[PDB]
């Protein structure tokens, strides 16, 4: 996350870290939507050009974490994955349309002050909050900057990072890139000279873009960190998987496969 700040304790209790088992490695962000289901980006699991291609036996997740580099005894939980599911129409060989995947935990994780599910949007929430200018929140342990110098690397924070960003008008998103944009994605970020900056970055893929409903006070996961061209460049924006638009598939998986 570029230009973000440290998360407060328990600020994003649905935050999940996706790791490759061996060699052990932090791969992507993800989110908890129930005691047995985790949401992430399809490209985190299946995407050859980025050394991504894994089944449930290649991965594990850590839930309830705040600091990347410290073992948080009696707070963090670890879990194997029973199975992974990728949207059947997920398109990697072009623009990553329907960049979404679900992962079922081998056992239910216990909720606590630090582990708690985020809500998925219904039509009314989507219709009322997905408006240009309305802000959402993106979180992750991804890189702090797109570039590196001889003395300063891209940077990997130890503490979870968070940034608030405004949803952008679709025509602006479209004109900012040559990559085709579908109705299964939306973009967010500040325009040049709105002053503020901020963006998700390498390593934040799969993490959530959440909005706090002023109607019932609950946090809803409106998007998934999907793609971008570099990080926090002027005139560029982050793209996110449109969760509500893929709700039918999400429901099918949970209903058809459990928990």
């Amino acid at each position: 996350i570029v230009e973000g700040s440290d998360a407060e304790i328990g600020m994003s209790p649905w935050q999940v870290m996706l790791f490759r088992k061996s060699p052990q490695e932090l791969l992507c962000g993800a989110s908890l939507i129930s005691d047995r289901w985790v949401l992430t980006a399809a490209h985190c699991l299946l995407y050859p050009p980025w050394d991504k291609n894994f089944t449930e036996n290649d991965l594990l997740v850590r839930i309830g974490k705040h600091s990347r580099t410290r073992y948080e005894a009696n707070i963090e939980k670890i879990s194997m994955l029973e199975k992974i599911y990728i949207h059947p129409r997920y398109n990697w060989r072009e623009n990553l349309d329907r960049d979404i995947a679900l992962m079922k935990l081998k056992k239910p994780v216990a909720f606590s002050d630090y582990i708690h599910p985020v809500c998925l949007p219904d039509r009314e929430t989507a219709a009322s909050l997905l408006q240009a200018g309305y802000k959402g929140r993106v979180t992750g342990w991804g890189n702090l900057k797109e570039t590196w110098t001889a003395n300063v690397g891209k940077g990997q924070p130890s503490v979870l990072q968070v940034v608030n960003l405004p949803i952008v008008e679709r025509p602006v998103c479209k004109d900012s890139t040559r990559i085709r944009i579908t109705d299964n994605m939306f973009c967010a970020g500040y325009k040049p000279d709105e002053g503020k900056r901020g963006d998700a970055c390498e390593g934040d893929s799969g993490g959530p873009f959440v909005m706090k409903s002023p109607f019932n006070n609950r946090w809803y996961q409106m998007g998934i960190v999907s793609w971008g061209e570099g990080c926090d460049r002027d005139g560029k924006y982050g793209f996110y998987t449109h969760v509500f638009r893929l709700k039918k598939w999400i429901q099918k998986v949970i209903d058809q496969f459990g928990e």
Partner: peptide, 29 residues
């Protein structure tokens, strides 16, 4: 929807995090 989206250390305790107000204010601007 169960108890989704209500954080134990914030909403459940009537405490607001440091930046959620910026989110709320954006539904006006």
């Amino acid at each position: 929807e169960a108890d989704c989206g209500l954080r134990p250390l914030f909403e459940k305790k009537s405490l607001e995090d440091k930046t959620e107000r910026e989110l709320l204010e954006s539904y006006i601007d």
